Amino acid sequence: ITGTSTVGVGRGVLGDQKNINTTYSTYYYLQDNTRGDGIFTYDAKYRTTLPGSLWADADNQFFASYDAPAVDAHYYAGVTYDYYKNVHNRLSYDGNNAAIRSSVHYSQGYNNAFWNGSEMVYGDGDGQTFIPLSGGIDVVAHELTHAVTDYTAGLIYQNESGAINEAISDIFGTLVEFYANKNPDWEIGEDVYTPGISGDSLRSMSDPAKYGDPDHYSKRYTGTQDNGGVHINSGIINKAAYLISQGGTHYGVSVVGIGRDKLGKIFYRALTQYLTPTSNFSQLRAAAVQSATDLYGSTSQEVASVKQAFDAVGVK
Numbered sequence: 062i063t064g065t066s067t068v069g070v071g072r073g074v075l076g077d078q079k080n081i082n083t084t085y086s087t088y089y090y091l092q093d094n095t096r097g098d099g100i101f102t103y104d105a106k107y108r109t110t111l112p113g114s115l116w117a118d119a120d121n122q123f124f125a126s127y128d129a130p131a132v133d134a135h136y137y138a139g140v141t142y143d144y145y146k147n148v149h150n151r152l153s154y155d156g157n158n159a160a161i162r163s164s165v166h167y168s169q170g171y172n173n174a175f176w177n178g179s180e181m182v183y184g185d186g187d188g189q190t191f192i193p194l195s196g197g198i199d200v201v202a203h204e205l206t207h208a209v210t211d212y213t214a215g216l217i218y219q220n221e222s223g224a225i226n227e228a229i230s231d232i233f234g235t236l237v238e239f240y241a242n243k244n245p246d247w248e249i250g251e252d253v254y255t256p257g258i259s260g261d262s263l264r265s266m267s268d269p270a271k272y273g274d275p276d277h278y279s280k281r282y283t284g285t286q287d288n289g290g291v292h293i294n295s296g297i298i299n300k301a302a303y304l305i306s307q308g309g310t311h312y313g314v315s316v317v318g319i320g321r322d323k324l325g326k327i328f329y330r331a332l333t334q335y336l337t338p339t340s341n342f343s344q345l346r347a348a349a350v351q352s353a354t355d356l357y358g359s360t361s362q363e364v365a366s367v368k369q370a371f372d373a374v375g376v377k
């Protein structure tokens with residue numbers, strides 16, 4: 062759309078009020094011209110055809126309950142874009158300011174969200190297992206990072222490379238959640254999962270086993286479900302990443318934490334410089350070590366912690 066940039070106001074999935082960037086041209090659209098080539102949010106109107114209609118609103122106020130998921134998908138995509146730009150100096154997912162598109166109200170009672178190779182898509186949830194998925198900043202950032210991976214390492218979505226692809230998305234989704242300071246934690250999807258149950262989440266990076274995911278290589282899933290356990294075996298990497306950041310002793314191996322910022326720098330470097338589409342866990346470890354070496358020196362503590370952390374999860 063061609064029009065005038067403006068700012069609107071609405072309420073998100075969790076009921077919080079926020080301002081969002083809109084464009085005015087007869088209607089007010091969810092089109093943010095302030096970031097790269099724009100962020101665009103569409104209404105899929107409970108259908109599965111994509112992307113749907115660019116979101117249009119008459120008065121620039123988005124307080125209807127039907128509006129909530131659009132408000133958050135639109136807002137959280139801006140935050141994520143900011144994180145990448147500010148923190149890693151990367152312009153959008155392609156590094157060249159590509160437009161960011163998302164659709165909401167995808168299908169009926171759809172308990173999922175995803176990156177389809179061109180855009181983000183969010184279901185509204187069935188109201189029991191999930192509420193609308195774009196209400197979780199870690200979910201939004203998890204999706205946008207899959208775009209980042211597609212344009213960089215290109216990790217194939219299956220088996221080990223696939224689990225790495227998933228872990229990357231959880232790690233950066235969590236780093237973004239801390240960046241925005243939105244009640245941050247090392248859990249995944251807590252804000253939109255099982256509205257009826259407090260305290261849980263979809264996955265845990267601090268203790269993957271809490272939800273039955275592996276936290277050691279010896280416990281990896283080797284069957285065929287889930288594309289070869291991409292959402293299961295990611296726990297091994299997630300745990301490694303949590304250890305690098307926070308420190309701890311796991312299976313008798315002690316890791317000194319080096320903090321979130323360094324975690325993010327090391328992983329981003331590995332992702333953008335060293336990983337390839339078919340990289341496996343063992344290659345990820347070599348990548349992460351090389352990255353930390355590049356950044357901090359081979360005799361650094363940073364390098365030492367990366368090694369310890371992988372040793373702790375059994376990745377050699």
Ligand SMILES: O=C(O)C[C@H](Cc1ccccc1)C(=O)O
Pocket residue numbers: 173174175176194199200203204207249250263292
């Ligand atoms: O892999 C994906 O992008 C799909 C999905 C995303 C998701 C993340 C966090 C919470 C809910 C949903 C998953 O099942 O992880």
Ligand SMILES: [Ca+2]
Pocket residue numbers: 118119120121122123124
């Ligand atoms: Ca309105």
Ligand SMILES: [Ca+2]
Pocket residue numbers: 238243244245246251252
């Ligand atoms: Ca949180």
Ligand SMILES: [Ca+2]
Pocket residue numbers: 199235238245246247248249250251
């Ligand atoms: Ca979280």
Ligand SMILES: [Ca+2]
Pocket residue numbers: 251254255256257258259260261262
């Ligand atoms: Ca819950």
Ligand SMILES: [Zn+2]
Pocket residue numbers: 203207227230
């Ligand atoms: Zn994912």
